[PDB]
């Protein structure tokens, strides 16, 4: 993720259309989830770190 692209994304768009997540920790165009505000492998790593209020393994 080019820092130029990250800065352009975070800067207020000239139009409301140019808005996207770009996971903040690592800025990934794809594979980002809004509710957790982080990318996909990023969320997995953070969950294995275990500092997230609610993420736990699912089985039933």
């Amino acid at each position: 993720a080019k820092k130029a692209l990250v800065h352009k994304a975070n800067k207020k768009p000239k139009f409301a259309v140019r808005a996207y997540t770009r996971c903040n920790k690592c800025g990934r165009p794809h594979s980002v989830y809004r509710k957790f505000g982080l990318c996909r492998i990023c969320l997995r790593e953070m969950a294995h770190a275990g500092e997230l209020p609610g993420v736990q393994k699912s089985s039933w």
Binding site: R40, I41, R44, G54, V55, Q56, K57, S58
Partner: protein, 99 residues
């Protein structure tokens, strides 16, 4: 007849039980009608994730958003009771919604 609804708002079963215990003890001490911590359907969110980058989509990992809610309908809302629950401090685990 006036009734005050208290919504208990958090994940952990142990934390919710402890919060219900503290609230019930405070109400019993203050002398107000309390039914108890009525159980509520536990909302369970599911989020699935693959375990690898760049394909291998057949393997994934799961999650839950396990939220516990309890209903405590305390009748006869004594003023001193209201101040007692307002001043009560609870662990950051559970969220208290007074309504």
């Amino acid at each position: 007849g006036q009734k005050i609804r208290i919504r208990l708002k958090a994940y952990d079963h142990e934390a919710i039980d402890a919060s219900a215990r503290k609230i019930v003890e405070t109400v019993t001490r203050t002398g107000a009608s309390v039914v108890g911590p009525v159980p509520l359907p536990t909302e369970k969110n599911v989020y699935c994730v693959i375990r690898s980058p760049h394909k291998y989509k057949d393997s994934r990992e799961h999650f839950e958003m396990r939220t516990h809610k309890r209903l405590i309908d305390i009748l006869d809302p004594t003023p001193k009771t209201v101040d007692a629950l307002m001043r009560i401090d609870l662990p950051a685990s559970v969220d208290v919604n007074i309504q």
